[PDB]
From a paper:
Porins, which are beta-barrel proteins that traverse the bacterial outer membrane, facilitate the uptake of small polar nutrients and are the main entry pathway for many antibiotics. The crystal structures of OmpF and OmpC show that they are both built of 16 amphipathic β-strands arranged into a barrel with a central pore. L3 folds into the channel and narrows the pore at about the half way point, forming a “constriction zone” or “eyelet” that governs the effective pore size. At the eyelet, there is a strong transverse electric field due to the presence of conserved basic amino acid residues on the barrel wall facing acidic residues on L3.
The overall sequence of the OmpC protein from the first isolate (OmpC20) is quite different from that found in the lab strain E. coli K12 and it is thought that the infecting organisms evolved from the uropathogenic E. coli strain O6, which expresses a related OmpC protein. Examination of the electrostatic surface calculated using CCP4MG shows that OmpC20 has a more negatively charged entrance than either OmpC K12 or the presumed parent OmpC O6. Interestingly, the appearance of the electrostatic surface is closer to OmpC K12 than the presumed parent OmpCO6, despite the greater sequence differences. This is reflected in the slightly higher r.m.s.d of 0.49 Å for 343 atoms when superimposing OmpCO6 and OmpC20. In the clinical OmpC mutants, L4 is shorter however interactions of L4 with L1 are conserved. Examining the pathway of the imaginary sphere used by HOLE to measure radius, reveals that the largest differences between OmpC20 (and 26, 28, 33) and OmpC K12 (and OmpCO6) occur in extracellular cavity above the constriction zone where the channel radius is narrowed by over 1 Å in OmpC20 (and 26, 38, 33), due to changes in L3 and L4.
Author numbering:
A (entry chain A), B (entry chain A), C (entry chain A): 1 to 354
Write the structure that this text describes.
Amino acid sequence: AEVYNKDGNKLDLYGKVDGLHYFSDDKSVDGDQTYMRLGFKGETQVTDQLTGYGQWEYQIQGNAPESENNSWTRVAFAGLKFQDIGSFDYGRNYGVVYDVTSWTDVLPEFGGDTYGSDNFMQQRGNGFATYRNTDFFGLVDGLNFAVQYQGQNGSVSGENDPDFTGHGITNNGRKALRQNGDGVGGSITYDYEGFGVGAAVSSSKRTWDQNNTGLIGTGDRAETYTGGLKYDANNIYLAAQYTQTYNATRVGSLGWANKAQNFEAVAQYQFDFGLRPSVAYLQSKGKNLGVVAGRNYDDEDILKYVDVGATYYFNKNMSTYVDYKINLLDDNQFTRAAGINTDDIVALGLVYQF
Amino acid sequence: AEVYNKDGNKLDLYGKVDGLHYFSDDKSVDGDQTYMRLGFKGETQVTDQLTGYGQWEYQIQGNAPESENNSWTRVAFAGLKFQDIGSFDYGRNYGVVYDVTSWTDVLPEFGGDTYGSDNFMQQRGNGFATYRNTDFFGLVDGLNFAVQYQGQNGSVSGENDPDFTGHGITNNGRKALRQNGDGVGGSITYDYEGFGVGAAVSSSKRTWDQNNTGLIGTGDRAETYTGGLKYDANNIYLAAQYTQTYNATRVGSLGWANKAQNFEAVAQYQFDFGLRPSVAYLQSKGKNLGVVAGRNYDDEDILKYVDVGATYYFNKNMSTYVDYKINLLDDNQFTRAAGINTDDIVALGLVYQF
Amino acid sequence: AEVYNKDGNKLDLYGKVDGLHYFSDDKSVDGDQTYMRLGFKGETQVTDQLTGYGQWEYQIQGNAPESENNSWTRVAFAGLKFQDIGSFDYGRNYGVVYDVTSWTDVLPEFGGDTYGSDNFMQQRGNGFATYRNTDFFGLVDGLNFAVQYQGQNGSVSGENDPDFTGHGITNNGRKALRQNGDGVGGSITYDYEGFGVGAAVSSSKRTWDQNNTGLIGTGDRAETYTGGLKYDANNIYLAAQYTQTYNATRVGSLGWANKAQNFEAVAQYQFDFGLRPSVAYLQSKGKNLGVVAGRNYDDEDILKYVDVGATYYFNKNMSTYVDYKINLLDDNQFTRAAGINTDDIVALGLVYQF
Ligand SMILES: CCCCCCCCCC
Ligand SMILES: CCCCCCCCCC
Ligand SMILES: CCCCCCCCCC
Ligand SMILES: CCCCCCCCCC
Ligand SMILES: CCCCCCCCCC
Ligand SMILES: CCCCCCCCCC
Ligand SMILES: CCCCCC
Ligand SMILES: CCCCCC
Ligand SMILES: CCCCCC
């Protein structure tokens, strides 16, 4: 909600509370999943052409006891936008690969999980410098593109930390699975009369910890190549994305896939009375994975499920949903070693937002 | 404060800063206790009869150094209210037992501590599904009731976690003392010309960890039976609550009382010039407690104190208070083993709220 | 921004997002430093003369992965202000020594680091009771003073905590380096036609942990004596502060300087077109430090650098800066033992604020 708008500056203070419950045989996801989000979008008018802006978003789990706190920053960035020249922002933000893969990240509860957070330039991560251009300098309507750089987020600097290695240290160190070296990426999208087409590419240097702490999927670089299609008109939403990755797709907590072929497709319709049915298919197929937890593998499913669900919108501030993950992965030594969910999940949600 | 009210949606952004200091011989409570609360109540008008709502409340300690952060969610829920039919909400919320026991939880600083948080269905906890009905479908003024369900909040799912057992795992695992199985509860209250009468009952299944990790007060279920009385009129506030519990009242960090008889009573008056004196008595008497930390017990006091204090209200946004816990527990092997405060505490508070 | 102003109460909900990056050979500070601040200043009008107020400020790091959360309260206090009599507030706040030393804490990114947080009464800390008087009861314009008390913030109360000692326990325990005993301080400042002069003194009792856990700089008390000068007019800002400390200046994580002589000086000019160049010098000279990490020392530099930089203000809501720490400390056994940064740092910042 816009809580302030005066002297060439406005502030949108937004958030949501999602009363959420998972039903599953997988007890590590079963039960109360209640959470909330809080954030602000701020925008100041410097000149007629120049805009300054800042955005921050925070998730706070609502399913924990008061003896603990599970919360985190999703995004936190500041930037400048000049009319028909482009925008530049820096901070924690979305990687440009998500410009295209977001087209399928529209399910009521699940979806969007052939990649993760702090996963190179595929979704949210630290230290993104992002240039964006809308309508090609105002010359070609519907033609957007983006060029992005991500600085290294490396190893821990404290010598007594258990994860300490001494290689690729940065101030904001973390575990190898959420590290990254210097990276560059770009996206291009074209919209025309409801139809949309998109491509995105990213190439990140991999850190020392990522290639020398016994994790699978080692190599000099992590790469992604994404193509996307969508139709968004007449209350119909169809979308599909195909991404091919190299040393970039996480295989649970074991490391990365040497190569992965990811596919997501979704079909949705929006009734005027408030109901919005959703059907989707997601798969991540690892290729030539090699040795994983004591056994040799070639091709293995990392993710594979059909998603059936529905959201009912009471209005723009209140909604409820059901989402049903029909999991098609088999329970095997690969999935157990990686700790990948292979059971079905039903989600029931009640959401207030402002 | 109401910071937004437009297009059938309003947002109350509220909070307080309590500059608070404890004086006590008990050094584990002595010293700076400064804290703050922040929250929002959001409400959207869907139709003339149907309201959607969401609420979130967060406590952040103000007595810690910047090298740490001690904060937590108190409540986080979303819901729907239909005129003369009832309300339904889900999330982290207050258990229905608190509908009656809250009548005595009105002291300046202390009180409200014959039960705790994440303590089955007695106060705040995760995964409450709560149906509420006010004025019996609009037919009997002053007659409210509630029916509540709490889903299991069980053991940790991570095999390498030190608290891991493998039994009763849920996604949002925690220590046995703050766990709970499936639970059901209800409350009924009747108000008439200042006088009030209330009853509440809860029955929760106890988890495996709760009955097999060496904690006292084991059994199939945790049960509470509460009766309450109050008078709230002519600037006078009197209230009393009696609760009898089975395997539900925590005896410090040792487990639970096999049986407990809890009693709280409070008398307050509100002068027009701003002063509000307060006198109260609280006791929790454990019955047939059995073996506790190497010794056999029958009846023992878990809690016993008189509370004398006063709040002065400068206005609705600013107040100050003194609260004096006159502790009647003796320092003995039981209280030391449980880690229960047995010394007197004086609290001085200065509170800004919005 | 003022998001509420009604019924004799107003609320300023403020904050900033700083997209920030450090370039340094020191890898423990190199990389993404993005962060945000959030806070509120609330003020209620009780009578024509009496004002009630509360303030809270929170920092949340924007450079971490979502698997962790690095945040903290900077200030959290409530208070009362009576016209021409003074103000009183209690909570987490700034020590009165900072009334004078803040005059040099005005650099784009660095500076203000001859002292730290939770460092006795020198900057932010827990449990400050602060009396402030502006314009000497309204009798002498430009003459301010302050009298402050800080309650003990001592050792941890949990017997199984690794930092447990059993001495000087308070409820809000923490590590010796951020502990303090009972302390008293005062400041006096006089402003006249742009020029300013200030003096401040603090004396804190040192805790048992501080003098018996193998830390350097032991003694009965921690003392500071500060003198300050400034000129703030005609778009020119000049300021200098000199502080002499005893058992109060932290030498990295090793303890404190027996004695320290701190000096900060800054010169800034503000162009109307938005640019604000900055040049500064900071030094902390330890005196008679004694034995430190196996070697005997007399005089050693704890801090020594020149700071060159600039801030460009697009407007009051958006700015960008560069800051260049030219580090004059040599890399030696003292600095390595203390873990003090001895390399140069360049900072680039883009800041949105509201
Ligand atoms: C022309 C308005 C009615 C359109 C009906 C849409 C049916 C969609 C079924 C998925
Ligand atoms: C096992 C208890 C299930 C609780 C259902 C909560 C539903 C909330 C969203 C409507
Ligand atoms: C009729 C107004 C005066 C009432 C005085 C109340 C005295 C209360 C003492 C506790
Ligand atoms: C030992 C120092 C006591 C500090 C008192 C603070 C009072 C704050 C509430 C008025
Ligand atoms: C009178 C307006 C112009 C003043 C110029 C200031 C120059 C400052 C150089 C640091
Ligand atoms: C303008 C502030 C943000 C600049 C970010 C620079 C990133 C450096 C990559 C090594
Ligand atoms: C196995 C039952 C699934 C039902 C979800 C709607
Ligand atoms: C022992 C002194 C108690 C005073 C509290 C008002
Ligand atoms: C060593 C290069 C420093 C430049 C900072 C402006």
